[PDB]
Ligand binder design. Structure first.
Ligand SMILES: *[C@@H]1O[C@H](CO)[C@@H](O[C@@H]2O[C@H](CO)[C@@H](O)[C@H](O)[C@H]2NC(C)=O)[C@H](O)[C@H]1NC(C)=O
Ligand SMILES: *[C@@H]1O[C@H](CO)[C@@H](O[C@@H]2O[C@H](CO)[C@@H](O)[C@H](O)[C@H]2NC(C)=O)[C@H](O)[C@H]1NC(C)=O
Ligand SMILES: *[C@@H]1O[C@H](CO)[C@@H](O[C@@H]2O[C@H](CO)[C@@H](O)[C@H](O)[C@H]2NC(C)=O)[C@H](O)[C@H]1NC(C)=O
Ligand SMILES: *[C@@H]1O[C@H](CO)[C@@H](O[C@@H]2O[C@H](CO)[C@@H](O)[C@H](O)[C@H]2NC(C)=O)[C@H](O)[C@H]1NC(C)=O
Ligand SMILES: *[C@@H]1O[C@H](CO)[C@@H](O[C@@H]2O[C@H](CO)[C@@H](O)[C@H](O)[C@H]2NC(C)=O)[C@H](O)[C@H]1NC(C)=O
Ligand SMILES: *[C@@H]1O[C@H](CO)[C@@H](O[C@@H]2O[C@H](CO)[C@@H](O)[C@H](O)[C@H]2NC(C)=O)[C@H](O)[C@H]1NC(C)=O
Ligand SMILES: *[C@@H]1O[C@H](CO)[C@@H](O)[C@H](O)[C@H]1NC(C)=O
Ligand SMILES: *[C@@H]1O[C@H](CO)[C@@H](O)[C@H](O)[C@H]1NC(C)=O
Ligand SMILES: *[C@@H]1O[C@H](CO)[C@@H](O)[C@H](O)[C@H]1NC(C)=O
Ligand SMILES: *[C@@H]1O[C@H](CO)[C@@H](O)[C@H](O)[C@H]1NC(C)=O
Ligand SMILES: *[C@@H]1O[C@H](CO)[C@@H](O)[C@H](O)[C@H]1NC(C)=O
Ligand SMILES: *[C@@H]1O[C@H](CO)[C@@H](O)[C@H](O)[C@H]1NC(C)=O
Lengths: 428, 121, 322, 49
């Protein structure tokens, strides 16, 4: 691994950093709320006569299973533009609540039901918010929304004072003041009737062919989930690194009971950096701390590959009563796990050291591990030994109030010193 | 500028020890200094006293330090061993003989007195 | 760490990051270089003595009082009262948030291994003078060393021998006052606190910046991956990858500049320790204010403290000259 | 200044910039540090008497 890291076939004496280790989770637990009954979306979808734009209906659905691949049979269409969610993934997500609605318009403005779309057909009739997330469906409804004599049940508004607020419906019918003449009379010049009606005939082609629009609009919030799909619940495990799913909140780690005084309305726990800390069980009323699985870094202390072939491993910043567990049956993030707990395991403030024997001795530091611990390759035939660094040779000076020491001979010596002065010039 | 073109009094700047000389050499993208320095060696320890009292007047060394091998008293330089007889041009007088701690008795030889007493008679 | 920070242990995130190339290898190399440099910094300031010297059991120095600075064996750690005050004055949930890859390695030279160096330097500088800077240490009585030090600044040596008691009293009183001077004001140790605050604040702002959106759907990798299909999920997470890479690059650049700043102060401290401590300095206003006499080193969290002992004239009388 | 440079006193530009996070806080901090440093520089060269 070190040879791969350095992109070379030869390495020199020193300590190198290679990669990280992480105890992968063993099993998974999935807990959902206990949803009862099925809400039929088919009868919700269709109406005997689709309401006009100036007065559109809406239904709010909750407390039922969320199956969404069944609607392909109860409504003909061509697009199924589910922008927010992948259609096949709806069987698992848990939602707060959902809205369903439908209304009939002309085909010239099918793309006008979208965030940021302006114009009289959307500004004064129906405009989406800029952060819409749903499954808009548009169908060319000529077989069921037209008559040879001209179907006249369809209505919209064209004149009004100012733009309407998002998802607001106005059903009043009052003569708009579109001139200097005071519009108090029933009708006349400069007094226009706000409600213009469509005229639909089979002679009309595309564009003017009437269309029907069906909208399912989700809304997601960190609130008690009431809608979720058909997924089976599972049981609970504790104190072991596992995958967990809670109400649609995927995660991985260890779960342990904690003395968190959550108030009844408070549900989640959070801390700095938007990291989830505690979760509330969808079935029982219990609060538990969540802690990420143990991880760390691995370093390789080796002498020169010229000299020998043995190495020693150092796991940084982990108590190595859990490293043998980290050496599991094809579970540890590093592929190699041969070392495991093959004796000569030493504990150090920096981390845990495998492959070297502690010696009650003191030399000069050669390969520095840290916290005053340094290793070397030597005999005791040849092995790796780790020891506490030695500052130097202890000395005692016979200080006294009437003593002096004077030299009687000298020595000339010559030393060397090297200093860089410049670097290679370049141009790009 | 400092080590080569002169002598440096800064401690442990131009080499380890008392500095004597330097020589420069060139290397690829750099320079190499050869520092020639001075280091003491064999040590001998003796007894010392901060002052010498002759006639009630203290005698302090001019430049050096007092020392004694056990019987006589000599004055020597700090960084080398070179004893000399305590004459009147190695010491200077300052004060009386009661305000100093550690003063010891001795006689300071006066080169003028016997020379000018033998001749004058 | 490269991956564990940018990618929340995902699988497709790692493969998408491999496309960008070897950006994070330089980040992993620069931090290692900085760590090696900061381990080497403390090896020059302190490790300048050949051997660990020791003081004699009997402690009497011409009437001078060094009890405030010499190590006291009563404490478990051989640290002088001044060092004990300094350690308490500097103040070293926040660490639990560093589970995203951030780590702090321990220094190579532990604290008592530094206290032993400081004690050795003090013993050498109060027993043998400056002679142990160059060659083997040579014993010399302390008042004689003081006489040499006065002779070094143009004052004849009889001045000390006639005024030993007054100088001893002044030195003792000065040390006594300087012991309380640090504790009186709280802003004496400001640079060290600035160092620790800058490091902590940089780490905190990195961790907080981790949770931004950078114009994406959400700030959590798991939600976006389980929320959309891959062909749009990758488009959504590309912006997150770019933002986090930019944040890491900014962090490492700032750390490089700060390390370059610190190295100069380390070199200056090494020069002061070589010149002021192991000898007498003729440079003006370098080793304290006034004519320089001596210096004493002490250790503090991530720093060194010098006590400069200097000489200053006082009462003046004016005469006529020719 | 953060906003006045990137955003020409607009309103939507400010809201779009808030989503990026706290990039310009460090820019406002570093320049202040430099200004304090350059004010302190002249206090050592001259103010020695
Ligand atoms: C490494 O883990 C072991 C096992 O938990 C620790 O040993 C126990 O540590 C706790 C507190 O950490 C003590 O209360 C127990 O008395 C310890 N038991 C034994 C048998 O030692 C050990 O302390 C951990 N390592 C470190 C450095 O804390
Ligand atoms: C000072 O030391 C030097 C060597 O360090 C001594 O010179 C040696 O003298 C002996 C006796 O003549 C020779 O056998 C050696 O070959 C000399 N060494 C060298 C390097 O020349 C010198 O004698 C010493 N000084 C005194 C006064 O003894
Ligand atoms: C201390 O130094 C004195 C210096 O005079 C030594 O005295 C001399 O010793 C030599 C050795 O035989 C004699 O030849 C001289 O005549 C002595 N000088 C005088 C004035 O009598 C003395 O021996 C030395 N003592 C020790 C222990 O080294
Ligand atoms: C030699 O030194 C001794 C003590 O260091 C001196 O002894 C005292 O000298 C004073 C003043 O002359 C006398 O009042 C004391 O009575 C002396 N005490 C003793 C025990 O002798 C001495 O004067 C010095 N000089 C000589 C020539 O002995
Ligand atoms: C020279 O020798 C020692 C050096 O420290 C000192 O003797 C001690 O002096 C103090 C106070 O004068 C006494 O409390 C100790 O009991 C002495 N130590 C002994 C007698 O072992 C002093 O500096 C000098 N001693 C003399 C006798 O002049
Ligand atoms: C050197 O200074 C220390 C510090 O003041 C002296 O120790 C003090 O002694 C007094 C009187 O016995 C006590 O009230 C203090 O509590 C002591 N302080 C400490 C820190 O122990 C010491 O006596 C001085 N040395 C001499 C020779 O006077
Ligand atoms: C669902 O089943 C659990 C399992 O015992 C039960 O406790 C709960 O009352 C049921 N109903 C709801 C709404 O959770
Ligand atoms: C239209 O809605 C009505 C309402 O009950 C329903 O009976 C009818 O089957 C629907 N027709 C469809 C979905 O084609
Ligand atoms: C390996 O070491 C031997 C002895 O130290 C030396 O002769 C040889 O050149 C080295 N090999 C390489 C590839 O450096
Ligand atoms: C080393 O020291 C430990 C504890 O101090 C002791 O248990 C062990 O026997 C010693 N071994 C040797 C070879 O000195
Ligand atoms: C010189 O020092 C030694 C111990 O290092 C001591 O035994 C000896 O007595 C000293 N010399 C003299 C003349 O006292
Ligand atoms: C000393 O200076 C003062 C003014 O500071 C002056 O009055 C006095 O005459 C001076 N001394 C002599 C001896 O001139």
């Amino acid at each position: 691994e070190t040879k791969c890291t350095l992109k070379s076939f030869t390495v020199e004496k020193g300590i190198y950093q290679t990669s990280n280790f992480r105890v992968q989770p063993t099993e998974s637990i999935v807990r959902f709320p206990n949803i009862t009954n099925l809400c039929p979306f088919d009868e919700v979808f269709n109406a005997t006569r689709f309401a006009s734009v100036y007065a559109w209906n809406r239904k709010r659905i909750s407390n039922c299973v969320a199956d969404y691949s069944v609607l392909y049979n109860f409504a003909p269409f061509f697009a199924f533009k589910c922008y927010g969610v992948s259609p096949t993934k709806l069987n698992d997500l848990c939602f707060t609540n959902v809205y369903a609605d439908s209304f009939v318009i002309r085909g010239n403005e099918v793309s006008q039901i979208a965030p940021g779309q302006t114009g009289n057909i959307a500004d004064y009739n129906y405009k989406l918010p800029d952060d819409f997330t749903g499954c808009v469906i548009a169908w060319n409804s000529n077989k069921l929304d037209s008559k040879v004599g001209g179907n006249y049940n369809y209505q919209y508004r064209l004149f009004r004072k100012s733009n309407l607020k998002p998802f607001e419906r106005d059903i009043s019918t009052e003569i708009y003041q579109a001139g200097n003449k005071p519009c108090n009379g029933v009708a006349g010049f400069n007094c226009y009737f706000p409600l213009r009606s469509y005229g639909f005939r089979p002679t009309y082609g595309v564009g003017h062919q009437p269309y029907r629009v069906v909208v399912l609009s989700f809304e997601l919030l960190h609130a008690p989930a009431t809608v979720c799909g058909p997924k089976k619940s599972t049981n609970l495990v504790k104190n072991k690194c596992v995958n967990f799913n809670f109400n649609g909140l995927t995660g991985t780690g260890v779960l342990t009971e904690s003395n968190k005084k959550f108030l009844p309305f408070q549900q989640f726990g959070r801390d700095i950096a938007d990291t989830t800390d505690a979760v509330r069980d969808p079935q029982t009323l219990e609060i538990l701390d969540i802690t990420p699985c143990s991880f760390g870094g691995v370093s390789v202390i080796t002498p020169g590959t010229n000299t020998s072939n043995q190495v020693a491993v150092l796991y940084q910043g982990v108590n190595c009563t859990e490293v043998p567990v980290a050496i599991h049956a094809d579970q540890l993030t590093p592929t190699w796990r041969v070392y495991s707990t093959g004796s000569n395991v030493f504990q150090t403030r920096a981390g845990c050291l495998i492959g070297a024997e502690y010696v009650n001795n003191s030399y000069e530091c050669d390969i520095p591990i840290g916290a005053g611990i340094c290793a070397s390759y030597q005999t005791q035939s040849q092995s790796i030994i780790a020891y506490t660094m030695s500052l130097g040779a202890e000395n005692l000076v016979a200080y006294s109030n009437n003593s002096i020491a004077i030299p009687t001979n000298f020595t000339i010596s010559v030393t060397t010193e090297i200093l860089p002065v410049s670097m290679t010039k370049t141009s790009v | 500028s400092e080590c080569v073109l002169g002598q440096s009094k800064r401690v442990d700047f131009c080499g380890k020890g008392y500095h004597l000389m330097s020589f420069p050499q060139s290397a690829p993208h750099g320079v190499v200094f050869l520092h020639v320095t001075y280091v003491p060696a064999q040590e001998k320890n003796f007894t010392t006293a901060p002052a010498i009292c002759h006639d009630g007047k203290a005698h302090f060394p001019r430049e050096g330090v007092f020392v004694s091998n056990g019987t006589h008293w000599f004055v020597t330089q700090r960084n080398f061993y070179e004893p000399q007889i305590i004459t009147t041009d190695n010491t200077f007088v300052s004060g009386n003989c009661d305000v100093v701690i550690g003063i010891v008795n001795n006689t300071v030889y006066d080169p003028l007195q016997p020379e000018l007493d033998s001749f004058k008679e | 760490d490269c991956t564990m920070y940018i990618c929340g242990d995902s699988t497709e995130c790692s493969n998408l990051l491999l496309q960008y190339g070897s950006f994070c290898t330089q980040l992993k190399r620069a931090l290692t270089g900085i760590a090696v440099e900061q381990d080497k910094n403390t090896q020059e300031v302190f490790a300048q003595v050949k051997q660990i010297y020791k003081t004699p059991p009997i402690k009497y120095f011409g009437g001078f009082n060094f009890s405030q600075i010499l190590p006291d064996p009563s404490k478990p750690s051989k640290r002088s009262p001044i060092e004990d005050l300094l350690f308490n004055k500097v103040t070293l949930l926040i660490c639990a948030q560093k589970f995203n890859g951030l780590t702090v390695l321990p220094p190579l030279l532990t604290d008592e291994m530094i206290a032993q160096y400081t004690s050795a330097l003090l013993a050498g500088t109060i027993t043998s003078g400056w002679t142990f800077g160059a060659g083997p240490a040579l014993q010399i009585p302390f008042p004689m060393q003081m006489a040499y030090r006065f002779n070094g600044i143009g004052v004849t040596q009889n001045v000390l021998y006639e005024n030993q008691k007054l100088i001893a009293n002044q030195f003792n009183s000065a040390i006594g006052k300087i012991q309380d001077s640090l504790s009186s004001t709280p802003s004496a140790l400001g640079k060290l606190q600035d160092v620790v605050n800058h490091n902590a604040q940089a780490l905190n702002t990195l961790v907080k910046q981790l949770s931004s959106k950078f114009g994406a759907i959400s700030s959590v990798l798991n939600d976006i991956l389980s929320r959309l299909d891959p062909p749009e999920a990758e488009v959504q997470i590309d912006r997150l990858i770019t933002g986090r890479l930019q944040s890491l690059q900014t962090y490492v650049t700032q750390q490089l500049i700060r390390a370059a700043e610190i190295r100069a102060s380390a070199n200056l401290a090494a020069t002061k320790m070589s010149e002021c401590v192991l000898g007498q300095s003729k440079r003006v206003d370098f080793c304290g204010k006034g004519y320089h006499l001596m210096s004493f080193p002490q250790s503090a969290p991530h720093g060194v403290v010098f006590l400069h002992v200097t000489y200053v004239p006082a009462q003046e009388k004016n005469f006529t000259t020719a």
